[PDB]
C-alpha cells in the first residue's frame, strides 16, 4: 500500500519489439 | 500614503547553483536528496503569494468604467489622476511622476503575472467608478448621481450639513484643486518620499548579491572552483574537497531562502493592510480617526507605483 | 415587505448547502493546512534514510560493524546530516504557525465585529451592506455566513441641490430631491419612497443666490390647511 | 501549436484571440484553458460597465435583495 | 455645423519651413484635443501630431519629431502647425482634424476632418 | 507502473509521487542545451623539458 | 505600434458579408478606430473605442475584438460602401495608422 520509485526497472513503456515467428543480448532481454 | 504589495519572484535551481553542471557533484548530493526539493519548494510557493497579494489589492471590482469627456465635475479638476496619452504606459500624470523616481547559475525572475498595464487600468476603473457613482459601486450596482451632491453625502458623514458645502461649493473646489497641485511637487522635491517602495527592492538585490558572492568561497577546500578540484586531484581525494564546497554551499542556500519567507512574511502583511484601505477608504467613507489620513476623512484616490501603490 | 424579505433569506440559505457540496475546492484554504503539514512530517520522515555521506543510513549497522573509534566517524556524519534536518522543520513550522496566528486574529476580529455587531466597514463582513452574521465551526477553521443588503432595480430621475421657494432655499433634511416628470418629491436615498416636500422634511438655509443649481418649486406647509 | 511568450516558448497550446477569465496563470498577462484542446489566451479584466454620467441625473434603487455568503 | 477650414498650403524648396493655419467655427474650441492627418499620395493616410485641450499633452510622429510644431491659439480659434527642415517625402494633403475627447481621459477619436490643403516640397 | 521518461504527463505524476494530477502548472524538469564539441587550445610549444 | 491589416484587398459583389481585420503589435486595450475613405472624400469616422457606431453611420458596420486583435464587419455590401478602410490606434502616441484595404465591386 505504498507508491516506491526506484531505477530498477529497465522496460522502456510502449516500446515495438522485434517480432519473430541468433539475437544480440544487450543489457537484457525480454522474451514472450 | 505609500504602501509596499508585491517584491520580485525569484527562482534558484539548487542544483545549479551548487553544482555547476558537474555529474561528480550531482551524485554526491543525492545523500540528503530531500533537501533541494524542499529549498525549490518554498521559493515556488513565496512567488505564488505574490500573484496573490496584487489581486486582492487591485482586482476586486470587475467592472470597467470611463468618466465623461468633460473638463470639471462641478468645478473639480481631477486631471492629473487620469489617463494621459503622453505618458508612456497610458499612465496618469502623478503615476507616471511615481514610476521614475523608483529605481547565471541557476538564479532567475519570474515575470510578475499582473502587467503594469493591467495594474494601471485597474486603477482607473477605480477611479472612475469613485467620481460618478460615488460609493455604490462597491456594494452592488453603480448609480450614478452628480459629484457636487456626492460631495454633499460626504459632509453629513463626518458631521456637517450639506448647505456648508453648497454655500462654500466655490472655495471648497479651489482648495481641493491646490492641493492636488502640491502633490505632484511634493513627491518630486522630496528624494525620500518613496523610500519605503525603494527599501524593498534594495534588500531583494542585496540579498541576491550576497548569495552569487558566496560561490567564491572556499570554505575550507583547496579551491572555490569546481572544476579545478576536478581537473587535478583524483576521484578518491576529489570526493573530500568536493564536499565541503557542497556542505557550504548548501547552507548559504537556506540561509538566503529563510530570509525570504521571513521577508516575505512582511510583505504580505502590507499587502493586506493595503487590501483593507482600498475597500475603506476607496470604495467607502471610514470613520476611523486616522486609518485614512489625518483629519476627517472624505475620499481617496488610488495610484498605482511600481510594486506598491499610493493612496491619496 | 416581511414577508419578501423572509423568502428571499430562507432561499439564499438553501442554496448554501448545494454550493459547497457542488464546488470541491470550496474548503481549500482549510484543506491547503492539513496537506502542508502532512506535507512537511513526510519529508522529515524520509530523511531518516539519507546516508549524508556514511556508509549506511542505519544506526545498528554502522554499530554492528565498524569499531569504536571507527563507528564515532561514521556515526558523526549522521548525527550532523539528521540534526541539520529538524531544524529546517523546526523553522518552517515557526513561520508556518505565524502565518495562522494572523490568520486567528483575523477570525477572532471579525466574530466580535461581524457576529456579536453590525460592521460599517466597506467589506469586512462580505459584499454589500452587512446586517448580520452565523458562526458555523469547520475543522481547524471557522466559516462564517454573512447576510447583506444589495440595492436592486435602479431608475434614473432628475435631481436638485435645494428648491427656491419664497427666496427661501430649502435643503433636504435627510433624503434627496427627485423628479419623475414635473413632480418634485424627496426621497431616502438606498429606496426609493417620494414623499411631497413639505417644512416637516425640508430646512431652510438662507436666500437663493449662492447655491448652483437650484430649482424652483413649492414647498407645502401642513399649518396652512388647518389654519 | 509552437507560440511564443514572455514567459517562454510555449508547445501544445493553440493561441485564443477571445479574451476569457484566468483559469491556468501562464505570467504576464497569459492563461491557459481547456476548452477539445488546451488554449492559451490573454486574460480579461472585466465587462465594462459606464453610468451615465450627467450633472443634475440620479439613480435610486427600487427594490432590494438578500444575499447570503461564505 | 462644425466647419475647419486649412490654409497656408503652397511649394516650397527642400529644407525651407511652411507653417499651416485651420480655422475653427461652430464648436467651442477649447473643448476638445485637435489633431494633424497628412494623406500622402501614394500611400494610406498618416497620423502627424495631436494637441490637447490646454496644450498640456503633445504627440508627434516619430518621422516629424523634433521640425514639427503644434499650436493652438484658444482666443482666435487656430491651430497652427510649423513645418522645419521640408522633405520631398512630406509631399501630402494635411487634414486638421477634432478629437471627440479633451486629449486626456476615456474618448478618443477622430470626429471632424477638413476640407484638406496641399503642400508639395521640390526644387 | 509510471515511466517517467515516457511522456511529460507521467513525468509530472513522477515528480508530484501521485497517480492522479489536479488542475495546474507544474514545474517538473530542467532544461540545458548539450554542447556540441570539445575544443582545447594550448600553446604551440616544441622545445621539450 | 504598427498595425497590420488583411487583407490588403478584396472583391466582394452587392449583399455580401465583408470581414476586415487589423491586429496590433502590442495590446492597445479597447482603442482603435475605423477609418473610411472615398475618393474626393475626407475620411470618416465609422467606429471609435472597439464597437461604439457614430451617429449617422448605418447599422451595417459593425465593431468587434479587444487587445491585440480587431475585426470590422459589414453585414451586407452595398454601392455606397466600396471604398478603402483604415484601422488607427489611439492606445499612445504616436498613433499608427494601418495599411488600409480597399474593397471593389466584382
Ligand atoms: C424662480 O423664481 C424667481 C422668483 O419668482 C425668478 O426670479 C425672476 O427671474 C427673472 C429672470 O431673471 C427676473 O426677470 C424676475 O425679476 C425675477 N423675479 C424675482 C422676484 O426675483 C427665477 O427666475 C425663477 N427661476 C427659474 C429658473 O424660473
Ligand atoms: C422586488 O423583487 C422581487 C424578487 O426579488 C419581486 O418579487 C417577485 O415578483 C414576481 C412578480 O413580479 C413574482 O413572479 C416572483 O415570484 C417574486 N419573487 C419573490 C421571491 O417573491 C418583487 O415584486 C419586486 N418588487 C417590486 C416593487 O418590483
Ligand atoms: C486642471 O489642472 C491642470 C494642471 O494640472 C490645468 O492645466 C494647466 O494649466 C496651466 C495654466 O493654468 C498650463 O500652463 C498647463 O500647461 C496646463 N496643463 C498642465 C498639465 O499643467 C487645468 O487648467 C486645470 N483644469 C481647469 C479646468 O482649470
Ligand atoms: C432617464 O434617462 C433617459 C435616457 O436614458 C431619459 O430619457 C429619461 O428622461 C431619464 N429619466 C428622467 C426621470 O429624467
Ligand atoms: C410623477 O410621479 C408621481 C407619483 O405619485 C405622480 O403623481 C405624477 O403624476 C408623476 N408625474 C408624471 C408621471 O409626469
Ligand atoms: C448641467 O450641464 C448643462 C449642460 O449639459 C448645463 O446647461 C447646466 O447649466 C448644468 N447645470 C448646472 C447646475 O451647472
Known amino acids: 500500500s505504498v507508491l516506491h520509485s526506484t531505477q530498477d526497472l529497465f522496460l522502456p513503456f510502449f516500446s515495438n519489439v522485434t517480432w519473430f515467428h541468433v539475437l544480440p543480448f544487450n543489457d537484457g532481454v525480454y522474451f514472450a | 500614503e505609500i504602501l509596499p504589495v508585491s517584491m520580485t519572484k525569484t527562482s534558484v535551481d539548487c542544483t545549479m547553483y551548487i553544482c555547476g553542471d558537474s555529474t561528480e557533484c550531482s551524485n554526491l548530493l543525492l545523500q540528503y536528496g530531500s533537501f533541494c526539493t524542499q529549498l525549490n519548494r518554498a521559493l515556488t510557493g513565496i512567488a505564488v503569494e505574490q500573484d496573490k497579494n496584487t489581486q486582492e489589492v487591485f482586482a476586486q471590482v470587475k467592472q470597467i468604467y470611463k468618466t465623461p469627456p468633460i473638463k470639471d465635475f462641478g468645478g473639480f479638476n481631477f486631471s492629473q489622476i487620469l489617463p494621459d496619452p503622453s505618458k508612456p504606459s497610458k499612465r496618469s500624470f502623478i503615476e507616471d511622476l511615481l514610476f521614475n523616481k523608483v529605481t547565471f547559475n541557476g538564479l532567475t525572475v519570474l515575470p510578475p503575472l499582473l502587467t503594469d498595464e493591467m495594474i494601471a487600468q485597474y486603477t482607473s476603473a477605480l477611479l472612475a467608478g469613485t467620481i460618478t457613482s460615488g460609493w455604490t459601486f462597491g456594494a452592488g450596482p453603480a448609480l450614478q448621481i452628480p459629484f457636487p451632491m456626492q460631495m454633499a453625502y460626504r459632509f453629513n458623514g463626518i458631521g456637517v450639513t450639506q448647505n456648508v458645502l453648497y454655500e462654500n461649493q466655490k472655495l471648497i473646489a479651489n482648495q481641493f484643486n491646490s492641493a492636488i497641485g502640491k502633490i505632484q511637487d511634493s513627491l518630486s522635491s522630496t528624494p525620500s518620499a518613496l523610500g519605503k517602495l525603494q527599501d524593498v527592492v534594495n534588500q531583494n538585490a542585496q540579498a541576491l548579491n550576497t548569495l552569487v558572492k558566496q560561490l567564491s568561497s572556499n570554505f575550507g577546500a583547496i579551491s572555490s572552483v569546481l572544476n579545478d578540484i576536478l581537473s587535478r586531484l583524483d576521484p578518491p581525494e576529489a570526493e573530500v574537497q568536493i564536499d565541503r564546497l557542497i556542505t557550504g554551499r548548501l547552507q548559504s542556500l537556506q540561509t538566503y531562502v529563510t530570509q525570504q519567507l521571513i521577508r516575505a512574511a512582511e510583505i504580505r502583511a502590507s499587502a493586506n493592510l493595503a487590501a483593507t484601505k482600498m475597500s475603506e477608504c476607496v470604495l467607502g467613507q471610514s470613520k476611523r480617526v486616522d486609518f485614512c489620513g489625518k483629519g476627517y476623512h472624505l475620499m481617496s484616490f488610488p495610484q498605482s507605483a511600481p510594486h506598491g501603490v499610493v493612496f491619496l | 415587505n416581511q414577508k419578501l424579505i423572509a423568502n428571499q433569506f430562507n432561499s439564499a440559505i438553501g442554496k448554501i448547502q448545494d454550493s459547497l457540496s457542488s464546488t470541491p475546492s470550496a474548503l481549500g484554504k482549510l484543506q491547503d493546512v492539513v496537506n502542508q503539514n502532512a506535507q512537511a512530517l513526510n519529508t522529515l520522515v524520509k530523511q531518516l534514510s539519507s546516508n549524508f555521506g556514511a556508509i549506511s543510513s542505519v544506526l545498528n549497522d554502522i554499530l554492528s560493524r565498524l569499531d569504536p573509534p571507527e563507528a564515532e566517524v561514521q556515526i558523526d556524519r549522521l548525527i550532523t546530516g539528521r540534526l541539520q534536518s529538524l531544524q529546517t522543520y523546526v523553522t518552517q513550522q515557526l513561520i508556518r504557525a505565524a502565518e495562522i496566528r494572523a490568520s486567528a486574529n483575523l477570525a477572532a476580529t471579525k466574530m466580535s465585529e461581524c457576529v456579536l455587531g453590525q460592521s460599517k466597514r466597506v467589506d469586512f463582513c462580505g459584499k454589500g451592506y452587512h446586517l448580520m452574521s452565523f458562526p458555523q465551526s469547520a475543522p481547524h477553521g471557522v466559516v462564517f455566513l454573512h447576510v447583506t443588503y444589495v440595492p436592486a432595480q435602479e431608475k434614473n430621475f432628475t435631481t436638485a441641490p435645494a428648491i427656491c421657494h419664497d427666496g427661501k432655499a430649502h435643503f433636504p433634511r435627510e433624503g434627496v430631491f427627485v423628479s419623475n416628470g414635473t413632480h418634485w418629491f424627496v426621497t431616502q436615498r438606498n429606496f426609493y419612497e417620494p414623499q411631497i416636500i413639505t417644512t416637516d422634511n425640508t430646512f431652510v438655509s438662507g436666500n437663493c443666490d449662492v447655491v448652483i443649481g437650484i430649482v424652483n418649486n413649492t414647498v407645502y406647509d401642513p399649518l396652512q390647511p388647518e389654519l | 501549436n509552437v507560440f511564443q511568450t514572455r514567459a517562454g516558448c510555449l508547445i501544445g497550446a493553440e493561441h485564443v484571440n477571445n479574451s476569457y477569465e484566468c483559469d491556468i496563470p501562464i505570467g504576464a498577462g497569459i492563461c491557459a484553458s481547456y476548452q477539445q484542446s488546451i488554449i492559451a489566451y490573454t486574460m480579461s479584466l472585466g465587462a465594462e460597465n459606464s453610468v451615465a454620467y450627467s450633472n443634475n441625473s440620479i439613480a435610486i434603487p427600487t427594490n432590494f435583495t438578500i444575499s447570503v455568503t461564505t | 455645423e462644425v466647419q475647419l477650414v486649412e490654409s497656408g498650403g503652397g511649394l516650397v524648396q527642400p529644407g525651407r519651413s511652411l507653417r499651416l493655419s485651420c480655422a475653427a467655427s461652430?464648436?467651442?474650441?477649447?473643448?476638445?484635443?485637435m489633431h494633424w492627418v497628412r494623406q500622402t499620395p501614394g500611400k494610406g493616410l498618416e497620423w502627424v501630431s495631436g494637441?490637447?485641450?490646454?496644450?498640456?499633452?503633445?504627440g508627434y510622429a516619430d518621422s516629424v519629431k523634433g521640425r514639427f510644431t503644434i499650436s493652438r491659439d484658444n482666443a482666435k480659434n487656430s491651430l497652427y502647425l510649423q513645418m522645419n527642415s521640408l522633405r520631398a517625402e512630406d509631399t501630402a494633403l494635411y487634414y486638421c482634424?477634432?478629437?471627440?475627447?479633451?486629449?486626456?481621459?476615456?474618448?478618443?477619436?477622430?470626429?471632424?476632418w477638413g476640407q484638406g490643403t496641399t503642400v508639395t516640397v521640390s526644387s | 507502473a509510471v515511466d517517467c521518461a515516457l511522456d511529460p504527463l507521467s513525468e509530472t505524476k513522477c515528480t508530484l509521487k501521485s497517480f492522479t494530477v489536479e488542475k495546474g502548472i507544474y514545474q517538473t524538469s530542467n532544461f540545458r542545451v548539450q554542447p556540441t564539441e570539445s575544443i582545447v587550445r594550448f600553446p604551440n610549444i616544441t622545445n621539450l623539458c | 505600434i504598427q498595425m497590420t491589416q488583411s487583407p490588403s484587398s478584396l472583391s466582394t459583389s452587392v449583399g455580401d458579408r465583408v470581414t476586415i481585420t487589423c491586429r496590433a503589435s502590442q495590446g492597445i486595450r479597447n482603442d482603435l478606430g475605423w477609418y473610411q475613405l472615398k475618393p474626393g472624400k475626407a475620411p470618416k469616422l465609422l467606429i471609435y473605442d472597439a464597437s461604439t457606431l457614430q451617429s449617422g453611420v448605418p447599422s451595417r458596420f459593425s465593431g468587434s475584438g479587444s487587445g491585440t486583435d480587431f475585426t470590422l464587419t459589414i453585414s451586407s455590401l452595398e454601392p455606397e460602401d466600396l471604398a478603402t478602410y483604415y484601422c488607427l490606434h489611439h492606445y499612445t502616441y504616436p498613433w499608427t495608422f494601418g495599411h488600409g484595404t480597399k474593397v471593389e465591386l466584382k
Open positions: 482634424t477634432k478629437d471627440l475627447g479633451l486629449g486626456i481621459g476615456f474618448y478618443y477619436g477622430l470626429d471632424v
Open positions: 461652430g464648436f467651442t474650441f477649447d473643448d476638445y484635443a
Open positions: 494637441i490637447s485641450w490646454n496644450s498640456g499633452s503633445i
